[PDB]
Design a protein around this ligand. Structure first.
Ligand SMILES: [Ca+2]
Ligand SMILES: [Ca+2]
Ligand SMILES: [Ca+2]
Lengths: 120, 182, 182, 182, 120, 120
């Protein structure tokens, strides 16, 4: 079935650097629906629901979401549809510490990954 | 059988700006009644964080699902087509459906506007709660076959009376039913 | 299977005077639960146009469906028999039904009055809206097996607290369920 | 198929003290949605007779149903196991069930708490009425998969705002639905 | 299936005259349920729901409905059940302008007709 | 099917005496679920729902219910599970007048009995 490499991952990077957040996925024969990628963050305020960061949907990128990351998050692959939904986050701030989620869908296939990002 | 948005959709709805919301809608056919379950999470844009101290006139907004004669969702609906389909597990079958007339709101039960005003029975009201908080009610008003430019429609209107200050618009779930076309 | 009034009934209900109302009631059997959908349009007589400035004491009225041991609707019900039947398309089968025990409210779940007071669980409350207006709520209180002179009963009571002035009594729709006799 | 407490349970629930309440819960599987119907009768103990003049801080209490990976009810649930089973007539089959995964709240729809706050859509609110009285509202807040120490959970929280004086806690019935695990 | 002749019709008549509103119907073999005829009007106030005018139900006529038409509306046929649900409206007023609906039912058969009445 | 002897019964006793409230039941072959016995009273206040008196459930007796009967009600049989769910009520008061219900369950078997108790 659809799966993602290292579905739980710890990443540490230094303040000011660029974090590479991997989301490399493997499709199965059944996954013949439309590819849909969603990244989310869990806010430091535990009373706030998760927020969307960036999408790949209908072969287009939508990035007008989480204000604190606006302009700093980009898909890294030049061929995302072939299995690479990774993103980077530039000029890391201590406030970027948190859990990031990558959701990869290609109906009926589904998989999710969580990354715990630590900024030093 | 179940026609749905999936239970954990990526942004699939456009109200004020492209893909600003997640409508969760599950339709399960119980013969001549459809059992429906709905909620909304606004993720960006005008309706994301309500502040009626700064914006006192933001009190109501509407999401429309427009269907053709085959029960297929039209492009100009607020809801997107990509992940609106018959279920497979927790996702959808791979191929877009061609027919869903048995899930459409009945046109004799709920006629399109005409020289006759639509009866109130073409509407169902529910009260939902923003952020799951008991002191944050909002009203979901669902109307069947109100809209032009389609064969069938389901319209969801969200409104509130309280002066909310920095309240994220993400709702509890509401169940209703309606009479099926066939 | 669906037992109903049809979705666009002619006057089929008598509250204050003959054929003064249209009760829309759809019962769909989901095994041991009946999925029910209801609304009311008053078309004539005392309850047609509410004016509590002129008539401050008109605040509540009741519609009774009384059934015999076969689940057949009794003549003295407020609801008429002619268009209460199993569905065919948007209408009914031609022949009056003889058996509908599987649609009756369960007598163990909802016993008739006895030396025991009926528990509150024998009632479901819903709030509907007159004319579909959000500031015109009224309450539909549905009780199972309250009534005498029958084997089974469904009672719909409509009431309101606001002082309505020239408000036509025609309601939004409400869905509920109940435990079936078999 | 129907999984239930039966419609006239003996005390089957323990909130403040052993067997102090009767939870009536009927779950009917409609494919990928469960149609659910619930009420509560408190029969003894702290929540039996509400008096907020004498006890102003009794305003909310919770009942938890905890299930293992097979959908079997765990011993530490507030609801007891003896009369929670698949239906036979107005009672249950003799043998305790081994599998009910198709009745469990879907874990993708309603994930367990994690680094992510649960969305409000994992909750349904209903307003019920104590003693069937229209001026005695209380709120039933149902949450799916909130609890630890289980694979699945349904949590019922009962709360009220009014200052009730000697009001017996026995409720009207409320219907809701939720997305099934399979 | 059950049908009505001229299911959308325009009728004009002069003030003070009697309008004949035809509703002639044809039954099909399947239509073996109870005959039910309902006439309605759409009020000039577009915010008001349709109002009942007159009924034929259980072989009886019910006419205690729309006050503005009380006493002025009658079924015209001496044998309505054979296919003639027509009505007339006497002493036409300019206020009688509007859309009138005839609904003919004989379960499972159903049909409706709308008449746009103009009074000059 | 599961049944109880004398499912409606009138009992009269004098004030100060002990009432014996019979609930003798007969199981059928199908009744292989857990035995469950519940006794209830209908309060003299007709606006009050029935109240639990005493239970036998999971082979244990629960009697912390109806305050007016606390300490005065007991199961009488030394072998209740063999068909005898009877109770007594000691030191009868005039206020004990009312209708008492015995519910016997052994899934799928179900039966109920009502006793009208009169105290003289
Ligand atoms: Ca009009
Ligand atoms: Ca009584
Ligand atoms: Ca968190």
């Amino acid at each position: 079935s659809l799966s993602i490499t290292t579905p739980e991952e710890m990443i540490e990077k230094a303040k000011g650097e660029t974090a590479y957040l991997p989301c490399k996925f493997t499709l199965s024969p059944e996954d013949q629906g439309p590819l849909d990628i969603e990244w989310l963050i869990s806010p430091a305020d535990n009373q706030k629901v998760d927020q969307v960061i960036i999408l790949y949907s209908g072969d287009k990128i939508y990035d007008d979401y989480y204000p604190d990351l606006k302009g700093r998050v980009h898909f890294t692959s030049n061929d995302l549809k072939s299995g690479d939904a990774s993103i980077n986050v530039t000029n890391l701030q201590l406030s970027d510490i948190g859990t990031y989620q990558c959701k990869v869908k290609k109906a009926p296939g589904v998989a999710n990954k969580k990354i715990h990002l630590v900024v030093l | 059988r179940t026609l749905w948005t999936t239970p954990d959709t990526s942004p699939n709805c456009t109200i004020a700006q492209d893909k600003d919301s997640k409508l969760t809608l599950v339709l399960t056919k119980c013969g001549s009644q459809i059992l429906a379950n709905v909620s909304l999470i606004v993720v960006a844009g005008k309706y994301h964080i309500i502040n009626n101290k700064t914006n006192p006139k933001i009190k109501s907004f509407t999401i429309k699902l427009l269907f053709n004669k085959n029960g297929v969702l039209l492009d100009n609906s607020n809801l997107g087509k990509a992940y609106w389909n018959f279920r497979s597990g927790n996702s959808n079958v791979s191929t877009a459906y061609e027919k869903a007339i048995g899930f459409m709101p009945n046109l004799v039960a709920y006629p399109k506007p005409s020289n006759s005003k639509k009866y109130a029975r073409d509407i169902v009201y529910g009260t939902i709660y923003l952020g799951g908080k008991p002191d944050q009610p909002a009203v979901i008003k669902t109307t069947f076959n109100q809209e032009t430019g389609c064969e069938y429609s389901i319209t969801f209107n969200f409104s509130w009376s309280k002066t909310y200050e920095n309240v994220e618009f993400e709702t509890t779930s509401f169940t209703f039913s309606y009479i099926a076309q066939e």
